[PDB]
mmCIF file of C-alpha atoms and ligand atoms in Angstrom:
data_model
loop_
_atom_site.group_PDB
_atom_site.id
_atom_site.type_symbol
_atom_site.label_atom_id
_atom_site.label_comp_id
_atom_site.label_asym_id
_atom_site.label_seq_id
_atom_site.Cartn_x
_atom_site.Cartn_y
_atom_site.Cartn_z
ATOM 1 C CA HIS A 1 130.302 60.566 104.936
ATOM 2 C CA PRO A 2 130.493 61.077 101.174
ATOM 3 C CA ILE A 3 127.114 62.989 101.026
ATOM 4 C CA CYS A 4 125.902 64.147 104.466
ATOM 5 C CA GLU A 5 127.768 66.566 106.741
ATOM 6 C CA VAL A 6 128.879 65.025 110.088
ATOM 7 C CA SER A 7 129.414 67.413 112.991
ATOM 8 C CA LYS A 8 131.007 66.163 116.250
ATOM 9 C CA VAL A 9 130.405 68.200 119.293
ATOM 10 C CA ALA A 10 132.256 66.442 122.167
ATOM 11 C CA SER A 11 130.200 63.212 122.582
ATOM 12 C CA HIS A 12 127.256 64.542 120.441
ATOM 13 C CA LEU A 13 127.049 63.511 116.682
ATOM 14 C CA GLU A 14 124.811 65.637 114.419
ATOM 15 C CA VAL A 15 124.335 64.493 110.862
ATOM 16 C CA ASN A 16 123.118 66.858 108.214
ATOM 17 C CA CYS A 17 121.507 65.207 105.235
ATOM 18 C CA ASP A 18 119.309 68.243 104.417
ATOM 19 C CA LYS A 19 118.386 69.106 100.830
ATOM 20 C CA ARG A 20 120.430 66.404 99.081
ATOM 21 C CA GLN A 21 117.781 65.106 96.669
ATOM 22 C CA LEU A 22 117.457 61.964 98.718
ATOM 23 C CA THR A 23 114.638 59.547 97.974
ATOM 24 C CA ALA A 24 115.857 57.153 100.592
ATOM 25 C CA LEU A 25 117.869 57.094 103.811
ATOM 26 C CA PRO A 26 121.660 57.023 102.825
ATOM 27 C CA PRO A 27 123.052 53.654 103.944
ATOM 28 C CA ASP A 28 126.481 54.542 105.364
ATOM 29 C CA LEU A 29 125.768 56.994 108.166
ATOM 30 C CA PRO A 30 127.739 56.820 111.465
ATOM 31 C CA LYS A 31 126.325 54.120 113.782
ATOM 32 C CA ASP A 32 126.690 56.692 116.563
ATOM 33 C CA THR A 33 124.536 59.504 115.094
ATOM 34 C CA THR A 34 122.770 61.490 117.956
ATOM 35 C CA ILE A 35 120.731 63.790 115.693
ATOM 36 C CA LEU A 36 119.736 63.231 112.038
ATOM 37 C CA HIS A 37 118.518 66.077 109.772
ATOM 38 C CA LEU A 38 116.621 64.826 106.633
ATOM 39 C CA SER A 39 114.852 68.098 105.849
ATOM 40 C CA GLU A 40 113.896 69.038 102.262
ATOM 41 C CA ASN A 41 114.384 65.762 100.580
ATOM 42 C CA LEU A 42 111.733 63.622 98.806
ATOM 43 C CA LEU A 43 110.772 60.994 101.292
ATOM 44 C CA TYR A 44 107.163 60.144 100.231
ATOM 45 C CA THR A 45 106.992 57.088 102.321
ATOM 46 C CA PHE A 46 109.479 56.683 105.138
ATOM 47 C CA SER A 47 110.058 53.596 107.296
ATOM 48 C CA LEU A 48 110.953 54.203 110.939
ATOM 49 C CA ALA A 49 112.383 50.628 111.063
ATOM 50 C CA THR A 50 115.188 51.642 108.682
ATOM 51 C CA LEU A 51 116.637 53.753 111.539
ATOM 52 C CA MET A 52 116.957 50.825 113.958
ATOM 53 C CA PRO A 53 120.736 50.449 113.326
ATOM 54 C CA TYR A 54 121.151 53.856 115.009
ATOM 55 C CA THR A 55 121.217 53.131 118.689
ATOM 56 C CA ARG A 56 122.033 56.579 119.971
ATOM 57 C CA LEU A 57 119.514 58.499 117.759
ATOM 58 C CA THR A 58 117.510 60.957 119.883
ATOM 59 C CA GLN A 59 116.216 63.490 117.285
ATOM 60 C CA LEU A 60 114.971 63.116 113.706
ATOM 61 C CA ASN A 61 113.799 65.829 111.365
ATOM 62 C CA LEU A 62 111.753 64.780 108.310
ATOM 63 C CA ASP A 63 110.302 68.204 107.792
ATOM 64 C CA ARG A 64 109.554 69.481 104.264
ATOM 65 C CA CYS A 65 110.011 66.053 102.709
ATOM 66 C CA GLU A 66 106.722 65.659 100.741
ATOM 67 C CA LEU A 67 106.012 62.908 103.200
ATOM 68 C CA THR A 68 102.622 61.171 102.894
ATOM 69 C CA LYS A 69 103.144 57.952 104.773
ATOM 70 C CA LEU A 70 105.270 57.247 107.783
ATOM 71 C CA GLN A 71 105.467 53.489 108.334
ATOM 72 C CA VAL A 72 105.576 52.664 112.041
ATOM 73 C CA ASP A 73 107.271 49.197 111.933
ATOM 74 C CA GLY A 74 109.787 48.322 114.660
ATOM 75 C CA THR A 75 110.800 50.408 117.648
ATOM 76 C CA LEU A 76 113.178 53.321 118.433
ATOM 77 C CA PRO A 77 113.614 53.319 122.199
ATOM 78 C CA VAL A 78 115.672 56.394 122.549
ATOM 79 C CA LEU A 79 114.127 58.795 119.998
ATOM 80 C CA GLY A 80 113.053 61.894 121.957
ATOM 81 C CA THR A 81 112.247 64.545 119.157
ATOM 82 C CA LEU A 82 110.333 63.957 115.904
ATOM 83 C CA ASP A 83 109.677 66.844 113.491
ATOM 84 C CA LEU A 84 107.197 66.009 110.693
ATOM 85 C CA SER A 85 106.254 69.619 110.082
ATOM 86 C CA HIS A 86 105.420 71.032 106.557
ATOM 87 C CA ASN A 87 104.546 67.751 104.924
ATOM 88 C CA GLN A 88 101.523 66.174 103.252
ATOM 89 C CA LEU A 89 100.236 63.877 105.987
ATOM 90 C CA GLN A 90 96.451 63.492 105.697
ATOM 91 C CA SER A 91 96.214 61.523 108.911
ATOM 92 C CA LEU A 92 98.323 61.473 111.989
ATOM 93 C CA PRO A 93 100.973 58.754 112.239
ATOM 94 C CA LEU A 94 100.020 56.573 115.195
ATOM 95 C CA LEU A 95 103.347 56.307 117.065
ATOM 96 C CA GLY A 96 102.773 55.063 120.624
ATOM 97 C CA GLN A 97 103.832 51.469 119.862
ATOM 98 C CA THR A 98 107.089 52.738 118.304
ATOM 99 C CA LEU A 99 108.470 55.762 120.032
ATOM 100 C CA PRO A 100 108.014 55.162 123.751
ATOM 101 C CA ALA A 101 110.534 57.873 124.831
ATOM 102 C CA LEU A 102 109.089 60.605 122.602
ATOM 103 C CA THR A 103 108.927 63.979 124.335
ATOM 104 C CA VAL A 104 108.466 66.313 121.322
ATOM 105 C CA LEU A 105 106.244 65.759 118.295
ATOM 106 C CA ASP A 106 105.801 68.471 115.673
ATOM 107 C CA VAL A 107 103.219 67.826 112.920
ATOM 108 C CA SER A 108 102.497 71.508 112.175
ATOM 109 C CA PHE A 109 101.497 72.421 108.644
ATOM 110 C CA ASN A 110 100.349 69.117 107.345
ATOM 111 C CA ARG A 111 96.856 68.315 105.948
ATOM 112 C CA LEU A 112 95.272 66.925 109.098
ATOM 113 C CA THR A 113 91.418 67.293 109.184
ATOM 114 C CA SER A 114 90.854 65.254 112.389
ATOM 115 C CA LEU A 115 92.721 63.154 115.074
ATOM 116 C CA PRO A 116 91.486 59.616 115.703
ATOM 117 C CA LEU A 117 90.367 58.243 119.045
ATOM 118 C CA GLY A 118 93.510 57.060 120.853
ATOM 119 C CA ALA A 119 95.911 58.958 118.492
ATOM 120 C CA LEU A 120 98.532 59.481 121.276
ATOM 121 C CA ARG A 121 98.200 56.224 123.156
ATOM 122 C CA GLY A 122 101.560 55.003 124.447
ATOM 123 C CA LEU A 123 103.325 58.379 124.119
ATOM 124 C CA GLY A 124 103.494 58.609 127.971
ATOM 125 C CA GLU A 125 106.682 60.762 127.969
ATOM 126 C CA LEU A 126 105.274 63.425 125.615
ATOM 127 C CA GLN A 127 105.955 66.960 126.688
ATOM 128 C CA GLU A 128 105.281 69.061 123.595
ATOM 129 C CA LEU A 129 102.745 68.618 120.774
ATOM 130 C CA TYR A 130 102.686 71.001 117.864
ATOM 131 C CA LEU A 131 99.732 70.900 115.485
ATOM 132 C CA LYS A 132 99.677 74.464 114.232
ATOM 133 C CA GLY A 133 98.348 75.095 110.757
ATOM 134 C CA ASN A 134 96.390 71.926 110.053
ATOM 135 C CA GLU A 135 92.646 71.774 109.286
ATOM 136 C CA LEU A 136 91.253 70.527 112.575
ATOM 137 C CA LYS A 137 87.570 71.337 113.578
ATOM 138 C CA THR A 138 87.593 69.536 116.915
ATOM 139 C CA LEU A 139 89.560 66.958 118.982
ATOM 140 C CA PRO A 140 88.615 63.484 120.092
ATOM 141 C CA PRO A 141 87.588 62.886 123.671
ATOM 142 C CA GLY A 142 90.466 61.626 125.859
ATOM 143 C CA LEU A 143 93.151 62.908 123.406
ATOM 144 C CA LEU A 144 95.563 63.845 126.194
ATOM 145 C CA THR A 145 94.817 61.100 128.731
ATOM 146 C CA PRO A 146 97.917 59.187 127.386
ATOM 147 C CA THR A 147 100.145 62.297 127.795
ATOM 148 C CA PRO A 148 99.843 63.562 131.402
ATOM 149 C CA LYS A 149 103.300 65.214 131.317
ATOM 150 C CA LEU A 150 102.402 67.582 128.488
ATOM 151 C CA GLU A 151 103.921 71.074 128.876
ATOM 152 C CA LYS A 152 103.245 72.848 125.589
ATOM 153 C CA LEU A 153 100.306 72.340 123.178
ATOM 154 C CA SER A 154 99.783 74.190 119.932
ATOM 155 C CA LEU A 155 96.467 74.040 118.045
ATOM 156 C CA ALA A 156 97.050 77.524 116.611
ATOM 157 C CA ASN A 157 95.698 78.388 113.197
ATOM 158 C CA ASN A 158 93.451 75.432 112.676
ATOM 159 C CA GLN A 159 89.688 75.865 112.129
ATOM 160 C CA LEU A 160 88.535 74.535 115.583
ATOM 161 C CA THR A 161 84.895 75.187 116.481
ATOM 162 C CA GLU A 162 84.614 72.929 119.547
ATOM 163 C CA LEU A 163 86.963 71.862 122.343
ATOM 164 C CA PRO A 164 86.139 68.819 124.463
ATOM 165 C CA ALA A 165 85.285 69.839 128.020
ATOM 166 C CA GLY A 166 87.860 67.462 129.671
ATOM 167 C CA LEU A 167 90.658 68.169 127.109
ATOM 168 C CA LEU A 168 93.087 69.470 129.711
ATOM 169 C CA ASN A 169 92.188 66.809 132.402
ATOM 170 C CA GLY A 170 95.111 65.591 134.520
ATOM 171 C CA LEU A 171 97.602 67.915 132.848
ATOM 172 C CA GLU A 172 99.410 68.798 136.056
ATOM 173 C CA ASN A 173 102.343 70.382 134.203
ATOM 174 C CA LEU A 174 100.907 72.376 131.302
ATOM 175 C CA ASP A 175 102.636 75.653 130.714
ATOM 176 C CA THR A 176 101.757 76.867 127.252
ATOM 177 C CA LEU A 177 98.437 76.571 125.266
ATOM 178 C CA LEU A 178 98.065 78.093 121.860
ATOM 179 C CA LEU A 179 94.529 78.350 120.477
ATOM 180 C CA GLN A 180 94.791 81.511 118.524
ATOM 181 C CA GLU A 181 93.277 82.019 115.079
ATOM 182 C CA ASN A 182 90.691 79.282 115.081
ATOM 183 C CA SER A 183 86.851 79.540 114.892
ATOM 184 C CA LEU A 184 86.113 79.025 118.549
ATOM 185 C CA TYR A 185 82.953 80.579 120.016
ATOM 186 C CA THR A 186 82.829 79.205 123.590
ATOM 187 C CA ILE A 187 84.702 77.440 126.447
ATOM 188 C CA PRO A 188 83.106 74.594 128.405
ATOM 189 C CA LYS A 189 82.704 75.389 132.103
ATOM 190 C CA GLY A 190 85.719 74.297 134.157
ATOM 191 C CA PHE A 191 87.781 73.655 130.972
ATOM 192 C CA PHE A 192 90.981 75.085 132.439
ATOM 193 C CA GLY A 193 90.654 73.088 135.739
ATOM 194 C CA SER A 194 92.614 74.252 138.804
ATOM 195 C CA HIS A 195 96.232 74.303 137.644
ATOM 196 C CA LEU A 196 98.080 77.531 136.945
ATOM 197 C CA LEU A 197 98.603 78.122 133.140
ATOM 198 C CA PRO A 198 101.355 80.738 132.530
ATOM 199 C CA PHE A 199 100.859 81.275 128.805
ATOM 200 C CA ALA A 200 97.557 81.152 126.867
ATOM 201 C CA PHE A 201 96.985 82.485 123.404
ATOM 202 C CA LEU A 202 93.260 82.877 122.723
ATOM 203 C CA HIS A 203 92.947 85.779 120.347
ATOM 204 C CA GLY A 204 91.594 85.722 116.746
ATOM 205 C CA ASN A 205 88.485 83.542 117.699
ATOM 206 C CA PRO A 206 84.827 84.738 117.267
ATOM 207 C CA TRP A 207 83.920 84.252 120.902
ATOM 208 C CA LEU A 208 80.072 84.144 121.483
ATOM 209 C CA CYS A 209 79.286 86.433 124.363
ATOM 210 C CA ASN A 210 76.136 84.973 125.861
ATOM 211 C CA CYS A 211 75.528 83.642 129.433
ATOM 212 C CA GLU A 212 77.640 80.539 128.547
ATOM 213 C CA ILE A 213 80.746 82.761 128.200
ATOM 214 C CA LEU A 214 80.663 83.609 131.981
ATOM 215 C CA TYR A 215 83.049 80.846 132.906
ATOM 216 C CA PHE A 216 85.593 82.151 130.399
ATOM 217 C CA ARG A 217 84.989 85.780 131.442
ATOM 218 C CA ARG A 218 85.779 84.861 135.109
ATOM 219 C CA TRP A 219 88.813 82.811 134.098
ATOM 220 C CA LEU A 220 90.099 85.715 132.061
ATOM 221 C CA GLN A 221 89.666 87.967 135.063
ATOM 222 C CA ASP A 222 91.770 85.686 137.302
ATOM 223 C CA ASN A 223 94.398 85.281 134.518
ATOM 224 C CA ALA A 224 94.820 88.575 132.714
ATOM 225 C CA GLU A 225 98.677 88.568 132.927
ATOM 226 C CA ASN A 226 98.741 85.006 131.467
ATOM 227 C CA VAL A 227 96.985 85.845 128.203
ATOM 228 C CA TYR A 228 99.239 86.818 125.217
ATOM 229 C CA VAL A 229 99.172 87.871 121.561
ATOM 230 C CA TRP A 230 101.293 85.873 119.101
ATOM 231 C CA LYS A 231 103.984 87.806 117.267
ATOM 232 C CA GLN A 232 105.909 86.061 114.496
ATOM 233 C CA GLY A 233 109.691 86.127 114.194
ATOM 234 C CA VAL A 234 110.464 86.707 117.915
ATOM 235 C CA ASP A 235 111.015 84.979 121.217
ATOM 236 C CA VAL A 236 107.997 84.488 123.433
ATOM 237 C CA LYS A 237 109.790 86.539 126.178
ATOM 238 C CA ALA A 238 109.426 89.399 123.677
ATOM 239 C CA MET A 239 105.611 89.044 123.341
ATOM 240 C CA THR A 240 102.876 91.259 124.801
ATOM 241 C CA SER A 241 100.454 90.148 127.543
ATOM 242 C CA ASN A 242 97.000 91.525 126.550
ATOM 243 C CA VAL A 243 93.787 90.053 128.154
ATOM 244 C CA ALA A 244 91.740 92.378 125.912
ATOM 245 C CA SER A 245 92.960 90.630 122.679
ATOM 246 C CA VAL A 246 90.184 88.032 123.466
ATOM 247 C CA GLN A 247 87.088 89.631 121.920
ATOM 248 C CA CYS A 248 83.321 89.006 121.575
ATOM 249 C CA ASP A 249 82.421 88.392 117.928
ATOM 250 C CA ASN A 250 79.784 90.825 116.407
ATOM 251 C CA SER A 251 80.795 93.491 118.949
ATOM 252 C CA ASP A 252 83.377 95.964 117.588
ATOM 253 C CA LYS A 253 86.104 94.396 119.849
ATOM 254 C CA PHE A 254 84.287 94.177 123.236
ATOM 255 C CA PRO A 255 86.654 92.151 125.497
ATOM 256 C CA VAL A 256 85.290 88.929 126.793
ATOM 257 C CA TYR A 257 86.771 89.565 130.321
ATOM 258 C CA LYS A 258 84.509 92.659 130.470
ATOM 259 C CA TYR A 259 81.283 90.729 129.624
ATOM 260 C CA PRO A 260 78.543 91.959 132.093
ATOM 261 C CA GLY A 261 76.264 88.904 131.884
ATOM 262 C CA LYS A 262 73.413 91.128 133.023
ATOM 263 C CA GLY A 263 70.216 89.145 133.396
ATOM 264 C CA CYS A 264 71.959 85.771 133.214
ATOM 265 C CA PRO A 265 70.558 83.266 133.407
ATOM 266 C CA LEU A 266 67.998 84.428 130.780
ATOM 267 C CA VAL A 267 64.526 83.781 132.211
ATOM 268 C CA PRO A 268 60.927 85.086 131.436
ATOM 269 C CA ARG A 269 59.971 88.382 133.204
ATOM 270 C CA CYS B 1 111.965 80.805 113.054
ATOM 271 C CA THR B 2 109.506 78.195 114.251
ATOM 272 C CA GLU B 3 106.818 78.274 116.914
ATOM 273 C CA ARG B 4 108.723 75.734 118.803
ATOM 274 C CA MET B 5 112.020 77.710 118.700
ATOM 275 C CA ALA B 6 110.042 80.867 119.751
ATOM 276 C CA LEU B 7 108.494 79.132 122.726
ATOM 277 C CA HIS B 8 112.011 78.196 123.829
ATOM 278 C CA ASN B 9 113.414 81.659 123.128
ATOM 279 C CA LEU B 10 115.747 80.283 120.544
ATOM 280 C CA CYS B 11 114.901 82.542 117.604
HETATM 281 CL CL1 CL C 1 72.421 82.733 127.210
#
């Protein structure tokens, strides 16, 4: 290509169009592109339809593109990975009519302040959803009904104050949940359901230790080796398990899993 | 390195 780097790795074709002052998709890219990098351009509006000529395209990065609108015309039947991180999106692109094979969606570090009812409808193959660093306060009911195969979910570093009780319903395969550094104060009873969850990050929330925290206290007991602290810059296999990171607010660091619950339920005596 | 890379041990 005269502008983008093209890197052939056996059958694989990875095209690097990163940081090239592009304001539009270049028109002469290989028809056989597997992976397209469009990071750090200026793609304010981007049309998914423009990528239809690329039949073998499985991964697209539009990260750090000052993107504000992603037009969802047309259909990309083989796109598996879409990275929209570090942009300016003020509402979530609604993609289920467009990317039926999507397994990975990253929209971390945008300007999202809520997700609409049905946001993920039609993304039935989704396995990973990253929403770290937006401005979310809660989630709509039924958010993950469309996505029963979900494996990893990040809501880290939002400003969440309520989680719907059935959020995790029918997630038979969930393996990582990141909820650290929000404004959460309680967990609805039964929130976790009955499936094993190997990695939960729950620290940096002002948990309210009253009788309604008992559910969470008992879950933390049964799951102490599954509760971790996020460390930046490393692999997750490098990170410390620490059930005591999860602390009662207004407490001086009293660990929720320790919560006595003495005299619950509170009644007149 | 990103959250996503970290969770796959690809940092
Ligand atoms: Cl109470």
